[PDB]
Structure formats: C-alpha cells, structure tokens
Amino acid sequence: KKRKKKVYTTPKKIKHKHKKVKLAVLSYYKVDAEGKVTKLRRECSNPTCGAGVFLANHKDRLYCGKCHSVYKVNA
Amino acid sequence: KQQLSKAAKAAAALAGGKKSKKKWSKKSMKDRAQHAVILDQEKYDRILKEVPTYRYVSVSVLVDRLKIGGSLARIALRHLEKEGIIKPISKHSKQAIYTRAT
RNA sequence: ACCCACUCGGCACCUUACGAGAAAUCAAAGUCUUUGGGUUCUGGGGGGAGUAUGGUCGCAAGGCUGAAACUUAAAGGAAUUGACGGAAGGGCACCACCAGGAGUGGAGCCUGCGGCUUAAUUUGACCAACACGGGGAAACUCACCAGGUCCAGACACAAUAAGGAUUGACAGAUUGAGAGCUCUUUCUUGAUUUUGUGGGUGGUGGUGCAUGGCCGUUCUUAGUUGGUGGAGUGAUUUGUCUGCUUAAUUGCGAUAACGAACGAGACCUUAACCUACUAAAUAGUGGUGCUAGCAUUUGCUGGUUAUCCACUUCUUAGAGGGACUAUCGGUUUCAAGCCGAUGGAAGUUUGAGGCAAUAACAGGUCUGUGAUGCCCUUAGACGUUCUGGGCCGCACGCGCGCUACACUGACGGAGCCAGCGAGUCUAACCUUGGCCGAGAGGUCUUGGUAAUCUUGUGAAACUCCGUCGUGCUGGGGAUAGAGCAUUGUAAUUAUUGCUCUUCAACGAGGAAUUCCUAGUAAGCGCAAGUCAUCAGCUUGCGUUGAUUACGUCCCUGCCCUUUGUACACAC
RNA sequence: AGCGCCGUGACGCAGUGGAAGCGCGCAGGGCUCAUAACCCUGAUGUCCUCGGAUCGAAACCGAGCGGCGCUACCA
RNA sequence: AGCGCCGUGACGCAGUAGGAAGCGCGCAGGGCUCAUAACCCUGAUGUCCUCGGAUCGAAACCGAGCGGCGCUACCA
RNA sequence: AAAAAUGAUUAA
Ligand SMILES: [K+]
Ligand SMILES: [K+]
Ligand SMILES: [K+]
Ligand SMILES: [K+]
Numbered sequence A: 001k002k003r004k005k006k007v008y009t010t011p012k013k014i015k016h017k018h019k020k021v022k023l024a025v026l027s028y029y030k031v032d033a034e035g036k037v038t039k040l041r042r043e044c045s046n047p048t049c050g051a052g053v054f055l056a057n058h059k060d061r062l063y064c065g066k067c068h069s070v071y072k073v074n075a
Numbered sequence B: 001k002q003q004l005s006k007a008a009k010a011a012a013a014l015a016g017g018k019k020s021k022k023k024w025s026k027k028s029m030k031d032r033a034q035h036a037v038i039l040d041q042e043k044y045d046r047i048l049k050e051v052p053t054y055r056y057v058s059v060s061v062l063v064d065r066l067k068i069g070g071s072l073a074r075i076a077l078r079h080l081e082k083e084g085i086i087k088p089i090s091k092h093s094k095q096a097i098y099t100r101a102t
Numbered sequence C: 001a002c003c004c005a006c007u008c009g010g011c012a013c014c015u016u017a018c019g020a021g022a023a024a025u026c027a028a029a030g031u032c033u034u035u036g037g038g039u040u041c042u043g044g045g046g047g048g049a050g051u052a053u054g055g056u057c058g059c060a061a062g063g064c065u066g067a068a069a070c071u072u073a074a075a076g077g078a079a080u081u082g083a084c085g086g087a088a089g090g091g092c093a094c095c096a097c098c099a100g101g102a103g104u105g106g107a108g109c110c111u112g113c114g115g116c117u118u119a120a121u122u123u124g125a126c127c128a129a130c131a132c133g134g135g136g137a138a139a140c141u142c143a144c145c146a147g148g149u150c151c152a153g154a155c156a157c158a159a160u161a162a163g164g165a166u167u168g169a170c171a172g173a174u175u176g177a178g179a180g181c182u183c184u185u186u187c188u189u190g191a192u193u194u195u196g197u198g199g200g201u202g203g204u205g206g207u208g209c210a211u212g213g214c215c216g217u218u219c220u221u222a223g224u225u226g227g228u229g230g231a232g233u234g235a236u237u238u239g240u241c242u243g244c245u246u247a248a249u250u251g252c253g254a255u256a257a258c259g260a261a262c263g264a265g266a267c268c269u270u271a272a273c274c275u276a277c278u279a280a281a282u283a284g285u286g287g288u289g290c291u292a293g294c295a296u297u298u299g300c301u302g303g304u305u306a307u308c309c310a311c312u313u314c315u316u317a318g319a320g321g322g323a324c325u326a327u328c329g330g331u332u333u334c335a336a337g338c339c340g341a342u343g344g345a346a347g348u349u350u351g352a353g354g355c356a357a358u359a360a361c362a363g364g365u366c367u368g369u370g371a372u373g374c375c376c377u378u379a380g381a382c383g384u385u386c387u388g389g390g391c392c393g394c395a396c397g398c399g400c401g402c403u404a405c406a407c408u409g410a411c412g413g414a415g416c417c418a419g420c421g422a423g424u425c426u427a428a429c430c431u432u433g434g435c436c437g438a439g440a441g442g443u444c445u446u447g448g449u450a451a452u453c454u455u456g457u458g459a460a461a462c463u464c465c466g467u468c469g470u471g472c473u474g475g476g477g478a479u480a481g482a483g484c485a486u487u488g489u490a491a492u493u494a495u496u497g498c499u500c501u502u503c504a505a506c507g508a509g510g511a512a513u514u515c516c517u518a519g520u521a522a523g524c525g526c527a528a529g530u531c532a533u534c535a536g537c538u539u540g541c542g543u544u545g546a547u548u549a550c551g552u553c554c555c556u557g558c559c560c561u562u563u564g565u566a567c568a569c570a571c
Numbered sequence D: 001a002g003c004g005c006c007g008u009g010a011c012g013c014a015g016u017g018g019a020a021g022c023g024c025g026c027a028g029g030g031c032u033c034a035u036a037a038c039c040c041u042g043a044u045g046u047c048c049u050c051g052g053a054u055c056g057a058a059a060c061c062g063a064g065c066g067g068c069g070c071u072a073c074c075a
Numbered sequence E: 001a002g003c004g005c006c007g008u009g010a011c012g013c014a015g016u017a018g019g020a021a022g023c024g025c026g027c028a029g030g031g032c033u034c035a036u037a038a039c040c041c042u043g044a045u046g047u048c049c050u051c052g053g054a055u056c057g058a059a060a061c062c063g064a065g066c067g068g069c070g071c072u073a074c075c076a
Numbered sequence F: 001a002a003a004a005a006u007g008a009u010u011a012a
C-alpha cells in the first residue's frame, strides 16, 4: 500500500501560550500609609471557592477563576 | 492477466447494455379457450340430455366435453347428484368420480 | 539314417565372473600404475565444420583430401531417485462416469467479486478466491475520505524557571459544534511540568517472498522411516514383495532378509437394543386410594409425594451386557477371505464422526494476538479520539443463493404433529397470562440462574372441507406511492415490522455445468452463530420421504508395479 | 491535350429505384490452469462530398474531391 | 529548366475547404509482480519547415526560400 | 488406430 503525502490547504494554527505579565503582586493588594488593608476583590458565594478567590474584572462581567462564576457589579 | 483498455471496457459495457434479451426457448402458445360460466337454457338442456350415458363424470370431463367453467361444472355436478341421476363412487375435494345411476 | 564316447574347425548360447570396466556390461571389453607378444589406422573440450580454399576423381549428383578467423563453460557417457507419457498391467473414487434424481446456467430479487464511478467508494483472497475473513458495516466496528481536538512524546541530560515551568477557564467573535481549539481583557493551581538533544511508547503503516503459531492443500488416498545384515565404487537399493485378499503396506503367504516404529486398524464421542441392577414433584406411568363435572349398566377429565402409595415400560444417567460377519449352505494356491440364507435391535469397519503419519506449498493470515524481525512514521502523527460521509455508489461481466413460472396448485376454514437449542441480580435476557390494537405492537403482572418457566417452542411442509377454472389467471410479487409502529442518541441513501394501493419480467430456461446411493436425494420448517435493530447466509435439528445403480475405467483424477525420457523450475 | 473507369462495415469485395449484404475482423458467454482452436450467441455502415429529378436513390443528373487507367500513329 | 504536389511532438500519421490540434510508437511516472518483461492508467512532448502577405483571427488561403516527391523537356 | 497447438526473464 503506497501512500501519498498529507498536503495541507490551511495555515497551521498555533498552540496557545500562557501570557507573561510581571504584575502579580501589584494589582491585588494595596497598602495604606498606616498599614490597614482591605482586599478590593470580591468573594465567591459558593463555600468551595476560597477566601482568596480574587474574582477578576472584565468590561461587563466578573469572572471567578476557580468556580467559573459570573456576577455583576450593580447587583 | 491481460487488462483490457478503457475503450475496450467501455465498448463491452455498451454492448452489454445494448444487448437484447436472448430468450433461449421456443415459445408456442395455444389459442383462447372460453367456457360459458353462465348457464343459459340451451346449455342446460344439453346438460340434462347428454350427461346421462356418460361412462365417466367429473369436473374435467364436463369442462372438456362441454364449454363450462370448473365452477359451473362443480355446482351443476352437485345439482345432478341432488337430482340423483348420477351416483357417487369416491367423495373427495379436488377430485370427483361419478357414473350412471342404478 | 539314428545312439553313445571322442576329436578338429565353425555360427552361436547358458551360468558365474576369479579378471576388467565409469557403469551398462564383457570369456573378451580378461592376462594393464605387478603398466612392454607383433603391427596398421584413428582421437585430443563443445561449436565454426566435414564448412572455406587448393588439389584430385566424377557427365552430373557428388566423393576423397581438408583449415583458419571467430565463438563458448560446458557439451557428452553410464547409472540413481523423482516427475511426466495421446506407455503397458493391476486396483480405485458420484469433489469421475454409467442409470437416474434434484438442480444451476434463462427471469426477478439477495449477497460476494471484478470493472467503472468516486473525496473516499478501505483492504486480503483469483480445484485449493468470489453468503470467504465467522465480513448480515446507520455511530462504533474502520483499516477509507473532508475536517476539529489530545498526547496517553516514560526515562536521562541541559536550558528556562519567584509568578515561572505549566495548565483549566465563564461571556463575545470563531467552529458543525456548550472543543478557551485559536483569539478579545484577567482569574485559578503551583518543580505535578515547558523547550531542545538521546531514547522509548504506539501504528487495522509495509513486507506472509523475513518469521512464529494456526489453518488449508498436496491427499480421502495408503502411505512413511530408521537398527543390524545382503547388493552397489557411488548416488542409492533390499527390507517396504510375484500371486490371492482387504477400505487399508489389511492379511494369507513367498522371500537376502531379520526383527521394529509412525500412519491404517485399534481408540474416544455419538444414533440405535436392553421389560436386567441403581434410582427419581426438576422424567415419568399406574392405583381414580381422596373429592367431584359430564353424559349413563362405565368412559372421558379437574385437585393428587404435607391431597397418599406402588413401579421404571415409555424418560434420564452410572456401572455393564450385547456382534465376534455367530450358525449354516456355497467358493478359494481350500489360507487370508468373499457370496447367499437363518437368527438377532444391529451383519458396507453396524451407521456418522473426532483424532490422523513422513515430506512439502515461497498456499493464506503482519487486518485475531502486549506473536514478531527489519523498514517506515511519531505532534499539522500513518498514534489516539470527535462530527460528517463512504464501505451500499451503477452503461456492464461473473460466482453462491432466495422466490417462481402454477390445478401434484393458489386462496379461505378446520384437523393437528418434532428434535436440537437458548435465556436476566456487576440488570433488564427468554417470556406465560390479563387488557387495548386490523396488524405490527403497546400496557399490568407472573415464571425461569433453568428436565421446574417461555415450552407439549400446538413449526412448516402435511390431511380434510369449500372458492377459483388453464386466462400471465385469483400463478408470481419485482418496482413504486401513502400511512401506522419497534430498535437505536441518530433510520434520509429508505434497519426492520404492519396496512392499503401499483402488480414488472417469468410459459420450465442455449452452449455449458454442480451435488448425490437410504432414512440418503429432495421438499419443509425450527433453533443457534453473528444481534440494540437487521437473514434471502452458515452451523445443527428434526418432518415428509423418491427414483436409479450395487458397475466400469469411457471422461476427470488417485494408488502400486514395469517401462521410456534430451524433464528435475519437474509436460 | 482528349477520353474512359473506380470510390459500399475495420479489411477485401457483392448489390434487382422500395434504407445494404458475404467472408474474415470485432464483442458477450462457455470449455481450458491460461491463450488458440472449438461450441452458443450478438453487433458494425452521410453507400467520397454537395445540390437536383423522383412519393422514395447506394444506383439517374449536375458539379467538386481522391485514385486508376487508355490514345499518344504518318512524317 | 518548367507543371503539379507535399513538410504536423523524439519518429510516423489524421485534420479540414479559417474559430489553434487527435492518434499510434518512443520517454517518464503509477497499478500488477519476489523483481521484471508484456499489459493497463496518467502525464509530458508539435514555436504545424522558415519568412512575408491578406484576415477580427491562419497549421488550413496567397507569395518567396529550403528540402523531398511526381510528371514534362530539340530534330529530321 | 477420429481430433489434441502453445506456455516470456531471473531466482538451492
Ligand atoms: K466438478
Ligand atoms: K480434493
Ligand atoms: K431452486
Ligand atoms: K469516526
């Protein structure tokens, strides 16, 4: 059984790589002059989400990251 | 073996498609044979007259000697057996055997 | 003229070679490496070639004499084994024929193959391929085509590596898609990994002409081998055989062979026979012993191992018995044996199987195998999964088959009969029965882990009684239209079932060709295998049950022996 | 220069104004392991073109094309 | 010398009365085969000898050249 | 005493 070569009619698509940002201590916690701190991130309602869940921010929605939940800011 | 060319294969396929049906037999047909299934007066008189002196009486001989269908043969035969001018010998479906009375 | 004994010469024979020879063979072809009686002629691998040229003879035909160039690794002799023979002899087979039966080849359809077509229409196989791969493929299967994912890239080295090495992601483009596959902004885990170099793991990739194992075939026949001895320089041969006999290299026997082995036989399973043992509400029968329902001077059924008891005939399985061609009549190298009859259940090894030698095929299978060498491939994979399609595609050719051409029938009503099976608790299998539905089916329970229930698989062919009436007819049921259901996520390219409608070729089939000898052919169905659904297939089972022949070598082949061969890749 | 003839199936050739035939060749099936032979069956033509007469031409008429021929003597 | 002709892949042959080329060999690659040969499939190969003209358009028509074919070539 | 032709190359 002689076989041909698999010629491709489409461009190769790239496997995704995790984006490299050196901002992982900057945009999560803030320090007051006295030193008092309250996290600006919100908390997942489900108990199995974690206290340091750090709900993300989008243009129009909030993303969990662990529990994959969606909320709104003007609730 | 020897592969035929594409033109030869097409010619053979086209010849086979164009080919007529070669029936390998002599087809002989007999002519139309009709039997009066409806019993009119003249045929009934012929029945009542010549059915006696018949040595052998059956659906087939009634059909052959009289142009009546098998259905009329069966019903008329049973009618004659009711009138008793024929007596039975062997009683069976699909085959009747009858002769003269007394 | 015969006989006997001799003798010389001659044509030759038979036995054995002591001798010779490569052997076949040879009383010379002996007296030869232990080489010498005398003498003439001829040859020096095979071809070119008894040719060219010259000479000579001949009327001619031609004869005699007679090279070279060139070309080539064998040509040749005798014998051995096999193979073959339109060679002989003897046996044998229904994959041969005779006498026949049933067919097939013609028709429609089913299925497999080829070819066309195709994006692919995946592929192997050409007596001993073609309902074969257990191959009846909607997904899978799948190996093919159009695309989309994932790594299931172990391990070693090194580089990255404090938000990294890496993932997963809801929403909006996007893709057939609710695959974050790619992106659009930013969240989760955290040395589990990413990258590259070695390596390894997979592959229904290739090669069965690299191989194993298995299977088929040679080959359904009776054939096969060594120990010692004999023959031969040897390859080899005898044993292992002329005759008779058997299915048989089966025996009787003959015998430079003797004793042995495998195969055949013997052996094992299975259908038969057992009024004999063992027994059995999971097989039965009987006592009607208990009540009774019906008819009536006595039969048929219902409840019977707690509503009891007896017995194994029917049934089953344990141990056995039984047939050994027994007896008899014939026939024989009177031996192996064979032909009749009588008994017996059984007298073609009683029937049918299972197993089945040495040697081989470049037979088939790498697509059964975590059987496998080597080659190839390995991240945009020939890996593995997901969606869709294909494997089914049709001017055509072929091989298995199914249904038919009808009255020995079709249709309708009724009578009413098998054997082999199989079947759920890791979950829906075989289904009684009740109800609804024309049907296919649907619903509610029941029994069966099974001699208990489906199931007495109440099958069909069959038989009776009626309709048809020789008309391609009411035979046939192809094609096609419409609807109702079941399986399955998914039914269109129609899974299948059911109802109504359409109602084609087909009038017994040219040349040709297949299977078969008694419970066989053939007809008829049933079960099982594949199965969620799907039989026109296979493997079995029983039902009804012929004709013809107990033979021959004519055809096609097989075995043994003899023979010929310029064959051995073997006619 | 003048005159005559021929053109038909792949090939060689018949052919009566009512649509064309022999032999091979070819094709299908069979037999054979296979090919041939053999057996059983099929198919193949604006009759060189283009017009005309005829109801209808392969044939008759007119041209055009391509081949084959014949005469070519007295000087 | 005249009069007719002809020239088409590497090799032969088909055009036709102008709308761009077919076939057969050869070559190459596939299918079959242990591998070949034969066979089959596919592809490539012709600037129609060169030049010029007429034409919307020429391998087809016209002219020249080149090459080959055929016929003709005082006179008594 | 009917007829019966053929079978490409190489590969212990
Ligand atoms: K046969
Ligand atoms: K055989
Ligand atoms: K039949
Ligand atoms: K798939």
Ligand SMILES: [Mg+2]
Binding pocket: none
């Ligand atoms: Mg010599």
Ligand SMILES: [Mg+2]
Binding pocket: C142
């Ligand atoms: Mg598939």
Ligand SMILES: [Mg+2]
Binding pocket: C208, C363
């Ligand atoms: Mg093999």
Ligand SMILES: [Mg+2]
Binding pocket: C240
């Ligand atoms: Mg021997």
Ligand SMILES: [Mg+2]
Binding pocket: none
């Ligand atoms: Mg198939």
Ligand SMILES: [Mg+2]
Binding pocket: C503
């Ligand atoms: Mg009808």
Ligand SMILES: [Mg+2]
Binding pocket: C131, C537, C538
């Ligand atoms: Mg099958």
Ligand SMILES: [Mg+2]
Binding pocket: C571
């Ligand atoms: Mg020969």
Ligand SMILES: [Mg+2]
Binding pocket: none
């Ligand atoms: Mg040969």
